[PDB]
Point group: D2
Chain length 266, copies 4
Amino acid sequence: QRFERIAVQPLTGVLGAEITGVDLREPLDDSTWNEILDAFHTYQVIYFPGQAITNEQHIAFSRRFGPVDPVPLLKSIEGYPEVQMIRRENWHTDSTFLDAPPAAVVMYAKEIPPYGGDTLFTSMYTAWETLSPTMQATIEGLNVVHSATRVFGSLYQAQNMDVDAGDRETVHPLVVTHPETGRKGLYVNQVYCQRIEGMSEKESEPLLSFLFAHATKPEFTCRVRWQEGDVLVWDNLCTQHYAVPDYAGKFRYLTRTTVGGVRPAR
Amino acid sequence: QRFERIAVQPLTGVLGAEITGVDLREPLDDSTWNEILDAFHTYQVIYFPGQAITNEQHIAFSRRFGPVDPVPLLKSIEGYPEVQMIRRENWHTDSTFLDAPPAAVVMYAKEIPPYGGDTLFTSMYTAWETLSPTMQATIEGLNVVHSATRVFGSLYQAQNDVDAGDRETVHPLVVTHPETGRKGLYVNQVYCQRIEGMSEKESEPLLSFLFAHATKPEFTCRVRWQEGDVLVWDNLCTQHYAVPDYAGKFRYLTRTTVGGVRPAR
Amino acid sequence: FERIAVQPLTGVLGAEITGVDLREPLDDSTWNEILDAFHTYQVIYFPGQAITNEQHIAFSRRFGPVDPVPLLKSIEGYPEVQMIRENWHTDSTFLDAPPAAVVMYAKEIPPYGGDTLFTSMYTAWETLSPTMQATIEGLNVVHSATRVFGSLYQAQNMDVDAGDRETVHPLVVTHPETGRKGLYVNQVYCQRIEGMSEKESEPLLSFLFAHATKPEFTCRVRWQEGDVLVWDNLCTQHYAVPDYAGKFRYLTRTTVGGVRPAR
Amino acid sequence: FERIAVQPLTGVLGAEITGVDLREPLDDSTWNEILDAFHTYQVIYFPGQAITNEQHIAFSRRFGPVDPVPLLKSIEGYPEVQMIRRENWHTDSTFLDAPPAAVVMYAKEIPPYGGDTLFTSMYTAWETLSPTMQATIEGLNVVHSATRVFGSLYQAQNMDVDAGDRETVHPLVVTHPETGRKGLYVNQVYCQRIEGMSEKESEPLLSFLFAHATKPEFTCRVRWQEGDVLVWDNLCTQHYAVPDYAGKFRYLTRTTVGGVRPAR
């Protein structure tokens, strides 16, 4: 459908859009914001090239999507605790080991190399919608146990307060309904998902592995090639991403805010 | 669980029993047969050593378990069409590509080498019972598509009749035994192609898990054949694996097939 | 690069090349830079071109012989130019002598959808440990078209005997121009490792398929009308994304020859 | 075989040996036949024995040195005799540089059924790989460690630990120090990765090898009886003690015989 206040160029037939004709330094009238949000909900990952915003403006824009909150586990900028920094992998979405993972993240590209460092995204809506009705009926009711044990718990510690938070488990549905759109998507990721609730690891592995692979098929993905000035927003519920490491040695600087969400619900 | 008419020695803690104190040349009184059948239903694969029976007696004994019928795609003995031969692998149970696979089979060892040629069996009841309640609730409702396409259909043809080999049937993933009422897993690697309504790629993880789980050594027994062993297996609640190892040694067994009904949930 | 502008697409492979009009024939020093860029970046494209079938052919001929591929559609009056109207693979590895390269011309595109991915099989190989490299170095692989148009494809319900015909290629190939070792394996045509069984081959091949298509070794080309694109058929694989269903897409294509893949 | 009776269990491995009383010491020609049988059949057992701890030890010593294994229970007054009382395919303690060459196990108390032990022939496992697959893995070494059994990985499923984490390296294919026969040397409990490869690289290959080596056709199954004395080669077999008895009392004793570091 038509967008009168913004220009929306989809990136692929499945997800992602470039949005122009907006200056994120200016606060946004109701009808313009509504179109941004409409675009966010359809395309799931959106970016706005050529922006030149400050830390306060970044914050302010992020706040139109939901509460923003300093995330500990990241560095965070001098004088602006809400803005985390990224500088110098596996498919995942952010922090699903929490009861209430982030709803979204807004990332600002400050310094980029001429090439390298692309970020991939998939649509977990499309992931779910491409399973057969029988497969959907089969896993619809399952919950999954998430935990950070491989990232900074005891499994990571194996290798060759900090640990107990890494080992702490939470439970989320295998399929979640988006709190704004009402659309079902697959909610599973390879970094944090440990097993299916009430099953053993050996029972869970076949199914989870299938789901990990299925959800990252190239046809469900888009690729964002970063440019200085890109402000990018991803839905943390209905996408996964993969920040490509390839640049090796080239300096890359982005800032990032995290917008909060509610418990994932079926 | 005392047996007054027969001697029942379980082979393992999970399945299989040797049964002695019976002569299968003699027809069997009601109370003795009932004990045999009681033992068949608990132990799932049973054998009777030291028998010396004829083709008619074999047939007759088989008929106490259910109808017996010549199986086409057979060798079959001269003058006795119901008795198939076995002479000179993967875990499976017999002919699940049929709408109505056999209920059981009774095998008679006529000539054996001194060692080699053991046959393994697993309990699909125990296979099912060892899955978690969540895994059971998850697959309970699924059906599986069976077909002979890898054995004598078009897929077999690719490795360098066909339409009967490719013909598909559908069975539940979990079946209730028609006599005992016990649920067992009903899946095998030779005939099961995919889960009904799913794609191959969707089915593969789950089926593979189920194939491996059902053949764990702890659910198995091993029968070491002796000339004169008469053996009966339930074709619904077990799978077996005839070990090829003898290479070159002559082995001769006869076999009857007892019919069954459509597998039901 | 004095005669052309080369913008790499990623840190690993792919370049946009501008400042050239492919209607004009190319002096020696300019061609040499194109070819230098082709060999480093492995898949290159030139936006904004407006060329005819003869010019396309001519440009393709600078990379090597071009020859009608009789297995494919082919344009009216121009037998060398095939028309185009999924899994990771490279082209036709079931031949003893697969193409060295392909030059593809985008004539009609939808506004979005239909991207094509590429990976570097050089980088795929270079990221295996020295022990894993020493282990598979010596292996050959059996390729055949049996899953695409042989008897296996036929299952599922001469064309067939050519589909079933097997050839053998090394698992690691040295590029005949660059001298660089790359991995040479693909999921569509590779059937088993030579002298092994399928069951023996499966673990190893599967690992290699997955490893070679890691996002970090890939680039993604988003087609535009007028793009002329050249890929090395030896040291890359590609994946034409289906995501457009019903949108009309028209590209032409020439196929350039090369030598039998060699260790 | 003039001095003993040898009944093979399967066409591939295992033999029952009768016509010997292990309380009596053994003349040269008889022992030689036992040892000949051990080397061909790889796991051998002698039913109906009634031996003491000293006799057990003595018999074990004919196969090689026997030595107390610390980190197992060990009997009162007889440090060489470990006890087994109340799973995955493996062979014993391959995390050592020098794992045992063999083990001699004595069944003292058994339930009437349950508790069978499986064995496979790693010779046959190796011999059934294609020549190309053999040439491909011939040169590889494997890293072994006890980290999943009693090291840090085991610890994660909530000194002991540093010995559990200690790694050693063994060939993937070993030549038996007495028979000269090549067998596969890989097991799922202790083998962690292939030397110089990553875990992700190693997994396909190791997994294939685990499965291949335990095919029923390479296996035998020993159904224990009170009085069985059983000897397995720890280099050229793996075993799997079936748990199927829960609560039935099972008592066996065990001695461990030394050998040489596994070599190509």
